[PDB]
Amino acid sequence: MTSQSSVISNSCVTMERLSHMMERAWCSQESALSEEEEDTTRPLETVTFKDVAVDLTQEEWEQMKPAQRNLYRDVMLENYSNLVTVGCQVTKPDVIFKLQEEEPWVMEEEMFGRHCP
């Protein structure tokens, strides 16, 4: 019947923000004084992807509606979607084996999982 909503708040909510979390550009550069131009001899030393990936904490993911859980793994995958496509190559970290289906912390020690059909 009526209340045919001219759609306002479906899937075009993630697309529109642009100033909601990505503006989080501080420690300003007011009237800079410390400066010394020099020769470019020292190497780059890009940091890693070990620390850009976050080691999984155990007590988390309680409140955490799994629209945020599956998106958190999509943070360490879309930051990873650069480094195995274009740029310096890193290895695959240890936590990536749980980026699986059930849970990260599934029981495998202590068998006899309740015989059943």
Binding site: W105, V106, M107, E110
Partner: protein, 194 residues
């Protein structure tokens, strides 16, 4: 060494435990995954007795703590020689018995004369009005890290049923880690299973 295998019997004897929280300083808690009760020294451990049929009058409930590890089974689970000399008696227990029972006038304590160990006996009461279980408030008198007694060795507490003659009617076993922090020591042993 007396047996630790679970004996149901024809009576349907099963141990019930309170679903208590995992706070840092709980008085008594139970793990369902490890069948492990964690509790304090000289504190109330209410153990429920869930039965499928009502036993005849004169039936009794014997508790006995045995070591879980097989290399320490020859040692009697006893109190440390410090706590054996402390004035912590409730007026009914000899000072070497680990297990105690409060809230009951008819408790027996036994030093068995073949197997040389400690046994704690209360007579079984039927469940009250509204109740499906009879709770025995148990008291352990040493932590598991007591030097000269349990000495960091995990123990199993054997709850047995017998009639007045002494023939065994049912036996359930559950592990016991007595320390000062029961609810936290459940958590590092739930971290042990995953």
């Amino acid at each position: 060494v007396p047996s630790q295998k679970t004996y149901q019997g024809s009576y349907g004897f099963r141990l019930g435990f309170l679903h208590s929280g995992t706070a840092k300083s709980v008085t008594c808690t139970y793990s369902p995954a490890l069948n492990k009760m964690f509790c304090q020294l000289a504190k109330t451990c209410p153990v429920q007795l869930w039965v499928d049929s009502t036993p005849p009058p004169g039936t009794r409930v014997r508790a006995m703590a045995i070591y879980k590890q097989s290399q320490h089974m020859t040692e009697v689970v006893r109190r440390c020689p410090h706590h054996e000399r402390c004035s912590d008696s409730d007026g009914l227990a000899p000072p070497q018995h680990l297990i105690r029972v409060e809230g009951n006038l008819r408790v027996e304590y036994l030093d068995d004369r073949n197997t040389f160990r400690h046994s704690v006996v209360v007579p079984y009461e039927p469940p009250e009005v509204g109740s499906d279980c009879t709770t025995i408030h148990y008291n352990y008198m040493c932590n598991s890290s007591c030097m000269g007694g349990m000495n960091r060795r995990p123990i199993l507490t054997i709850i047995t049923l017998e009639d007045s003659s002494g023939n065994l009617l049912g036996r359930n076993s559950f592990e016991v880690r007595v320390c000062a922090c029961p609810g936290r020591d459940r958590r590092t042993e739930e971290e042990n299973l995953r």
